[PDB]
Every structure is written in C-alpha cells, then in structure tokens.
Symmetry: C3
C-alpha cells in the first residue's frame, strides 16, 4: 500500500540531500519540500522553537524500513520525525506510477 | 468518508483554477493552496527537479470519482498526483460542515 | 494511535498561541506552523477566499478529546477545522517520544 511520509528537517541543505537520496535510491517516487516552517516542540522537558522544512515523501509500505534507515543515516537529529500516513485512495495512473518508480 | 486530498500543481494559476472549480462544483468544501514547493521526482526514468504548489482538498470518498475527473480535465500534467488521506477523527461540528458542503 | 492533526488559523498570532499551548500542556509533542496559505472555501452559495496558516500537530487519539477542547477555547472561528490523519507507521524512537510527551 502507498503512503505519504512526513519528515521535518532543520535546513534546506538537509531537505535537498535527503529528498534527492530517497528518489535516486528508489525509496520514493517523489519528494516535496515545503519551506518556512516554525516548529514548536518538547525537548527534555523544555518547549523550544526552531525553523524547519517539511518533506512529503510518496512511497510504499515495504520501502519504509530502508527509507527509515537511510533517513536516519542522513538526518542530523538523533530522533528524526519519520511518520507515514496511509493513502486511502488515489488516481490509478498516479498510483501505478508510484509503484513503478519505487523498489 | 471524510478525507484530505493532496494535489501538486506547477503554478498559482492552475492552483486557483482547480481550487475554484472543485468548491464551486461541490466536490470539495475547501481547498488550501500551499506555495513554494520544490519537488524532486522520477520522469522518464530519470530524476528531475521542479517548482510546484500544494493543494489540500477537504472532501469525501463520495466526491472522489468526479474530483479525479475534473482535476485531470483541468491539470496540465499527463499524470497528476491525486492522493487521499483518511480523516480518522475530527471536530464533530467541522466534519458535519464538511459533509454538508460537499455533494 | 498516533496522529497528525491539521488545523487552519487566520494569523501567525493565533498560530503561535495554539502551538505553544498544545505543547506546553502536553496535548501535542510538536506543532509545525506553515505560513502563506490561500484558502478557497464555500460560504453558502459563494466561493470565498482568505489567507491562513496551517498547523500540523503531532498527537494521539487519547489527547484528541482535550486537544479539541483547548483549540476551540483559543480559536476565533465558530467552527475551527480540527482533523486527524492516522499515522500508519513510523520511526519507533520518534513515536515513543511522541507518546511520552503527550497525555
């Protein structure tokens, strides 16, 4: 089954490097980089704020384990956000393309 | 039945044309246009990069068939991205509004 | 179950107010604020436009009830958009951190 994976990154350099690696390695068919995020989260009991970018990764459920391994290898954070949202339905031509361009 | 549909487009013009049509035609209760995307994907087997915008469509599975048809008619890409993410739960009054303002 | 909640707000001021509150109150582990949204939606027989910002809230189904309550108390809209998308799978360490920082 196809999924849209969300990944937040600290900079455009990390956004581009991870985005390119995932597509190049066939772990994703496409990756969108959304810039300008202001992120507020908890870290060791403190609430902190930082500027980030969001990656939207179009991939499949069986590509997830390797995708995670590669993202962790490239991401500067010890616990990076990598969460997959299920694609309940989509246009057939697109889903076929996604499948054909992954794995 | 409620879902959030993601569609990427090449320009603000196409974004607005599609957003307007979907809500006007009761295929969506609302559409968010997110600008500034950088997209990295597979085309003809090779890795390319392009600039795009993201549409977040609030709709339902009942509206999806016609939504797909209309997006394809109004979208320049040969294979446009039209993927639905399911809404697992939400503010009751908002979901009621979404269901009422769609179809 | 872990979820990504979407909320649209009218200004950065409301975005920040809700973002800080949910995280400080442990109703969410992190909140991303995405600016620059153009929203096209239905108001009766009219298709209207407005500027907004998007909040991506990392939380759980268990915090959702209280999260909805707090968002409504801090949101100027009569019917704020609060919809949850299910996280099918994710980086184990990340989901652990998410659950440990939300109640």
């Amino acid at each position: 089954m196809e999924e849209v994976v969300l990944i937040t990154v600290p900079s455009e350099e990390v956004a581009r490097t991870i985005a390119k690696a995932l597509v190049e390695e066939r772990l994703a068919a496409c990756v969108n980089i959304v810039p300008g995020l202001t992120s507020i989260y908890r870290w060791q009991g403190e609430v902190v704020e930082d500027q980030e970018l969001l990656l939207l990764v179009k991939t499949t459920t069986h590509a997830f384990p390797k995708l995670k391994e590669r993202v962790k290898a490239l991401h500067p954070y010890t616990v990076p956000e990598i969460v997959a949202l299920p694609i309940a339905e989509g246009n057939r031509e697109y889903l076929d393309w996604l499948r054909e361009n992954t794995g």
